[PDB]
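Supplementary material to the annual report.
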Amino acid sequence: MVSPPPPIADEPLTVNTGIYLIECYSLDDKAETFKVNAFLSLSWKDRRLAFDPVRSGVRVKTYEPEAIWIPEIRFVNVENARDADVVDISVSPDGTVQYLERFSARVLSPLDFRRYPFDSQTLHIYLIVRSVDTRNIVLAVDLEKVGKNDDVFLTGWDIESFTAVVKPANFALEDRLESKLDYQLRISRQYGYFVIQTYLPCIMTVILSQVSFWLNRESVPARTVFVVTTVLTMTTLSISARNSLPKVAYATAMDWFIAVCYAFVFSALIEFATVNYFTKSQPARAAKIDRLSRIAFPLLFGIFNLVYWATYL
Amino acid sequence: MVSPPPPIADEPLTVNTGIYLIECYSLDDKAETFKVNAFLSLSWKDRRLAFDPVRSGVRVKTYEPEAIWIPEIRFVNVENARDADVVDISVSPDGTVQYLERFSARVLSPLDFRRYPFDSQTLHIYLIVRSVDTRNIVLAVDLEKVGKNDDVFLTGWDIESFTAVVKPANFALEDRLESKLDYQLRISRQYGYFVIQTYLPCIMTVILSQVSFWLNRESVPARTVFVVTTVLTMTTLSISARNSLPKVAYATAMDWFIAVCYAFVFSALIEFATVNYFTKSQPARAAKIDRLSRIAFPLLFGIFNLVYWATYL
Amino acid sequence: MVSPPPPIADEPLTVNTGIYLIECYSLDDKAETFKVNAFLSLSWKDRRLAFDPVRSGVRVKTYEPEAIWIPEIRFVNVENARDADVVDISVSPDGTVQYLERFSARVLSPLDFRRYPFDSQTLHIYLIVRSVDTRNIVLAVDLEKVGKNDDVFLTGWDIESFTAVVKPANFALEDRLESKLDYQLRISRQYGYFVIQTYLPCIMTVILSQVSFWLNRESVPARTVFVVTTVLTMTTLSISARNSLPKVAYATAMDWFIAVCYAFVFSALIEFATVNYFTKSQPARAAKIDRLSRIAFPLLFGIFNLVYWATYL
Amino acid sequence: MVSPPPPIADEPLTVNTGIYLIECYSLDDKAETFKVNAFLSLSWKDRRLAFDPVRSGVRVKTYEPEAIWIPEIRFVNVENARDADVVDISVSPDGTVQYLERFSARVLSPLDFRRYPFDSQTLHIYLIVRSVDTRNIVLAVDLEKVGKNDDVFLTGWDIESFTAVVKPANFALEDRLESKLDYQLRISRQYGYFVIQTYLPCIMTVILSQVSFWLNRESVPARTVFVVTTVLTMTTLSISARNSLPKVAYATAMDWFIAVCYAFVFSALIEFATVNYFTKSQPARAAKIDRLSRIAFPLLFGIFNLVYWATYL
Amino acid sequence: MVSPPPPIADEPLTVNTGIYLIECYSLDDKAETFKVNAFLSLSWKDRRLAFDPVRSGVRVKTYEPEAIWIPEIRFVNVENARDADVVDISVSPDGTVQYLERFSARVLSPLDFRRYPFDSQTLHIYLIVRSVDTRNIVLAVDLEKVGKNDDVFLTGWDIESFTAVVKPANFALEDRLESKLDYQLRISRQYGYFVIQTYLPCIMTVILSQVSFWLNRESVPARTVFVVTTVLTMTTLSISARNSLPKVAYATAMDWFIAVCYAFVFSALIEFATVNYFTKSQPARAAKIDRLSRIAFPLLFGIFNLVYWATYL
Ligand SMILES: CC(C)CCC[C@@H](C)[C@H]1CC[C@H]2[C@@H]3CC=C4C[C@@H](OC(=O)CCC(=O)O)CC[C@]4(C)[C@H]3CC[C@]12C
Ligand SMILES: CC(C)CCC[C@@H](C)[C@H]1CC[C@H]2[C@@H]3CC=C4C[C@@H](OC(=O)CCC(=O)O)CC[C@]4(C)[C@H]3CC[C@]12C
Ligand SMILES: CC(C)CCC[C@@H](C)[C@H]1CC[C@H]2[C@@H]3CC=C4C[C@@H](OC(=O)CCC(=O)O)CC[C@]4(C)[C@H]3CC[C@]12C
Ligand SMILES: CC(C)CCC[C@@H](C)[C@H]1CC[C@H]2[C@@H]3CC=C4C[C@@H](OC(=O)CCC(=O)O)CC[C@]4(C)[C@H]3CC[C@]12C
Ligand SMILES: CC(C)CCC[C@@H](C)[C@H]1CC[C@H]2[C@@H]3CC=C4C[C@@H](OC(=O)CCC(=O)O)CC[C@]4(C)[C@H]3CC[C@]12C
Ligand SMILES: CCCCCCCCCCCC
Ligand SMILES: CCCCCCCCCCCC
Ligand SMILES: CCCCCCCCCCCC
Ligand SMILES: CCCCCCCCCCCC
Ligand SMILES: CCCCCCCCCCCC
Ligand SMILES: CCCCCCCCCCCC
Ligand SMILES: CCCCCCCCCCCC
Ligand SMILES: CCCCCCCCCCCC
Ligand SMILES: [Cl-]
Ligand SMILES: [Cl-]
Ligand SMILES: [Cl-]
Ligand SMILES: [Cl-]
Ligand SMILES: [Cl-]
Ligand SMILES: [Cl-]
Ligand SMILES: [Cl-]
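Predicted assembly:
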């Protein structure tokens, strides 16, 4: 068929849209994608479908999608076209069509890892419709039809809210008007997992590097094992940790924590080398170095942790 | 076709549901998903299809899905719509339709890892139907049609039971009634694998750390190698072990066992450092520290293992 | 159409089945699945399709699948419904339908890892048919139509035979009679790969641990390096090896070999600790301990290897 | 239908093409593939579809793809045929068809890793059409119809431009004329990630190897630990780094940096072995070797880094 | 439709086949599969479709696949049925059909790793056609229609040739004649990648093991670190390397190189143990052992590399 002609002859047809989240899963940090399963509801007026509720013995009447004109509604930030099962189509005597489908889709939405793993994100789902030559078509948001099931979970996140920006973006694209709505799922990451995956190994590796200051300065190999293994451990943890993220250009909050831990451990190595350098000549100097280090290192590290955890929580 | 009109004019149409598990596989702890292949049986009354059992020499008669109205039944907590092959449709003389399909689906159901790897789970499969404008449709459970084949296996688990909650959850959603049933597969994990994957490496690594107390106090590098490699091994096992799980915030029972093992090993490091601190001056104190440690450590560790394994078995 | 009515009025229709393996691949030990690509041949009698071979100038005549009744044949132990292309349908003058399709499927079959990697398996392909309300349907095996192409290979396995159990298993399921056939692909694993993936690292790691008995007792750190690295290597090989298998409860033959190797290595550690414990006081005892160990350890290890490889080969 | 006959009887029909990038994701360096989601626009002349704009009260008129002849346009460097949803088909009074589809595809395009990770690439998308027996078909580029949305991102790259080579490549293939267009997405890699993934571990590992020159020459085990672990670390980092790339024959810029770092580290090992060789006999020589090394190594390494980072930036 | 009747009443219908490779990708050594995107061209004679070239003013005329009989051509060694888009079907006045499709497929073809990574392979694509009851059908090869695009690449390989074995294998299968063609893609591996992935780490690890002979015999821990870490490095490199291949029974050329390197490294270990054994008593003997070893080991290793690289290049 063709689109409903305008009664005002010059009026845009608006399609009232709503999304109801049923299932939300597979939030992939590295791919910056997530999978969503929801209701899509569309509503518009096609007076061609009007009918007498009495002559037609039905209060509503229901159609197959093949029977009537339906707006071509597409998702933008999706990998493939969604998979949809039309659920219901109900017309009113005045021509008001209420369309309901259930869809699943792989949404592509970029993440801001700067504050990671203390990050919040806005996942976006962009709806769009392209105007035909006979009529311009415009999207709108029916707030009654937006929401999400209570049993919606992302197994590592707190889900804040699912809302829609009511005023759409209308613009020209290849000589036709396109109309775009922005559905926004706000989430904030649950960082605790990482505390025992990365932060604790880091803190313990720093402490372990500091244990070397209490070993006798003459047992040089022992202190060597301490200093060297803690340096290699920091390097391994650093690489491992950045392996969870996409190849982002910037540095994360975890990056800063790991880099400072690497600073403390490598400084313990430099301290061991200096102390070893002054042990025969000027043993008083070496002894003073260890005496001060045993207090300074764990103090600067404690203060650092205070500023860090105070800041990012 | 169209939905069966009510005889009582105000009676909800109930559809009797049953699921019979044929194959159960791919229980993914990290994805919190599993795959199921089963019979779905639905049964309802459409008097329009009734017929005289004597005038018609046939006892049942069978239709194709296109011939008669069939209720649209959806799964809720699933990733894509199921793949189903209709098996049979048999109408009764009184108008009772018995529908049978075989379907496969990827179900998404969250797991409770707090007690892991000594955990039990309830996998859920939610059936749902949305009411039409002409009639409300309500789900119910035919126990004769619920079960699972005996040769059904989840390799890492014991399958306890497959049952259904008979009273459905009926509620309003986007201005129509939905009726939702909760099918429940109860399972409990087989922990033995993990005993030799993680628990043994941990217990042996704690013992290894304790061997250092019997080495000569003067051979500082040897004891250093013992202490340091056991600390790094504990960390490695911690990270490795948590890699099996989704990014849950909390701690598993395995987490507690590993954390206490880390406590014993790091305590062995602190002991080595203390003994080394007193080896030249006050060799009696250092010697006594080794003497007590050699009894306390394996004893406290044995007691801990006793309380832990007594608790979680 | 409808199912072929019985000539004896009470006789079950048997469907003669055959499978011809064309391609066999992706035998996944962890997933307990494999992929199969084969011919499925069915043959039954439908008198309605008989015809005069002389009046009709054709010796066979061929139908389209939509033209005639075809039995619904399903695989049981499969993940999704198979993918099939109907190849040919030939009716005989008497009504004998010979149906031929080519299908691919992902078969789900449990593996018995107890004797692994010296294990044999039976991969199963269960065919099944459900009786309709008009007639009971029963499966049988046409031996002429069972076999496999010679260039069928499972890269890690020797394929012994592909045969079928002629008598089917008939049983009641949800108030109808079902008929189930068991096609059996027998395979036996080629263990050589594992000899150089796991068995050699283990044997050499044990030997390496035994070299420590020949090092000077006064050079404590050297012997520490030997003993400790060999223990951690054994643990690493153990975890690595068990990562190839599903989360089975039991122990494999490889588990036993690795565990005994771990016994030898940890025993060498305990020996080094005893010798070190007796080195200052009672150097004769320490020396005697090493003297005996250098003969006992590699001797008991050789004997063990003799029993092990004699048993599992 | 059939293809439009030529007005000149011997004139090729040109199809004006355009691509508008909507989504660009999953650029896999190892697979040398990327995924694209875009508009494909085609435009050509079919006089059979011309019409009087006055007798027909419509200014454009729109057809279904089944109604009119549409040119078969294929992508060359793609894995499967694209997935396309026809969006709009608009005929003009003169017979000018404006066709618009939205497609997703997995494009296969080779990468030049010689300058990696400081590399720029040209991803190619080849359009092609095969001439029919009735008429030759030739592709062209409608610049109005080429572009890309501003929010297009490759989460690891800077996107320079998306342009088309206007002149197509015409050639004979299996006795017919083919016409091929080259759409080119120019991108350049964001190397910063790799600086902290590989370049820093390498630089620090070289520095660590240099610390050994400041340890007392008599503490041979300590220096052994430094030298040996830094060499093995270089090897591990090399293997890890080359694991991100396809099995390319040549060497990348990163290969060179890692190889020079390996030169410096192995040179420190060779230095330690030489120093240890001369420590008893000719200790002045050994002392001088350390004296010069402490100045030369970090100087040659700093100079090298200066030349390298100056060159590849 | 039906198959073309024979003019000779007893003549087999031949189908002239050709494949033109467009895209060749994803050669998976472990899966022994590769993906191909190509033209499939078929050509046969159906007199029923003939026409007068003069009365009919048309030189060819074109049909839709539904209009005429088309032979069912299947690939044998493929995982799923191919995905094909029919491109063109052109009949000649005499009745010669020229059919052209573009298909993609996942081909399964076994590899011979004995000479790896210096291996050449023949990837096979088997075409096959099954005879119908009315006529025997036989495959043949049209060389004009066989080839590959010049920009066809398998990263990590040299593509030698794509040819066909002209004489097909005709044989009986389940009581009908099948006709099978062997298309052969010859390739040879580019080993250079492996040179820097495995061969260099091995060679340098052997050299590193030899450095121990130049360290002072009294620094037992130092030599212990050398010998032990190099032995474990060899084991790790071995396991890593074999992880790239399927679970083949035999040994590759790379296996032999790695095994000889392990021999040299373990022999250096045995030498260190022997030298350490004779260091107190008979220092002349130990000294002589190091003196000879420092020349023999690197010499025998140089000769070995000479024979090996001379052989496999
Ligand atoms: C100039 C003389 C007198 C002193 C020579 C010693 C310096 C060369 C050392 C001392 C502290 C070292 C720094 C300690 C910490 C780091 C953090 C490290 O960053 C990371 O590891 C990033 C990890 C991540 O991003 O997750 C980079 C090297 C750097 C700057 C080191 C550079 C070399 C430094 C300056
Ligand atoms: C000055 C000397 C005398 C005492 C200083 C030593 C303390 C700082 C040590 C003693 C016990 C240690 C604790 C022992 C065990 C743990 C558990 C450990 O947790 C895990 O490894 C988690 C593993 C998992 O969850 O899988 C984190 C470090 C911690 C808190 C250690 C923190 C540092 C502690 C308090
Ligand atoms: C003689 C006294 C003074 C000191 C020894 C204390 C014992 C408690 C030690 C000595 C030998 C140890 C055993 C050495 C070998 C192993 C094999 C180990 O099994 C595995 O590693 C499983 C590997 C796999 O299954 O893949 C389990 C611990 C166990 C029994 C150890 C348990 C603790 C033992 C008995
Ligand atoms: C003269 C004697 C007394 C001692 C020196 C023996 C040589 C044989 C050493 C000195 C420098 C070494 C080279 C140092 C650096 C390299 C680059 C190295 O390349 C890499 O491993 C980088 C990894 C990558 O390419 O990604 C390969 C070994 C090699 C050629 C080494 C080969 C062995 C060499 C030539
Ligand atoms: C005091 C003297 C007589 C030595 C006594 C110890 C022997 C038992 C050692 C010395 C040399 C060793 C051999 C040195 C090298 C190897 C190669 C090794 O092969 C591999 O690692 C294969 C790796 C791969 O296939 O990739 C198998 C063990 C073996 C034969 C060793 C077996 C044990 C041997 C004979
Ligand atoms: C994270 C940086 C640590 C810096 C610690 C400086 C300690 C100075 C000790 C000097 C002793 C003479
Ligand atoms: C909310 C959990 C934070 C855990 C980290 C607390 C900071 C510990 C610092 C230890 C420094 C020695
Ligand atoms: C869970 C915490 C375990 C810590 C063990 C402490 C042992 C102290 C022994 C004191 C002997 C001197
Ligand atoms: C199936 C139960 C396995 C539990 C194993 C407990 C072993 C405790 C060892 C403690 C050694 C100190
Ligand atoms: C795996 C069991 C090894 C047992 C070796 C016994 C050696 C006894 C040596 C003690 C002599 C006093
Ligand atoms: C990349 C190669 C490093 C070469 C450094 C040589 C240093 C000179 C040592 C002088 C010894 C007396
Ligand atoms: C192919 C196996 C190589 C083994 C190398 C042994 C070299 C022996 C040298 C002994 C010198 C006394
Ligand atoms: C084609 C490149 C082959 C590389 C062979 C390197 C051989 C080095 C042997 C060194 C022996 C000491
Ligand atoms: Cl969509
Ligand atoms: Cl020492
Ligand atoms: Cl569903
Ligand atoms: Cl099936
Ligand atoms: Cl395409
Ligand atoms: Cl095929
Ligand atoms: Cl050491």
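The interface with chain E takes residues 221 of chain A (CB under 8 Å).
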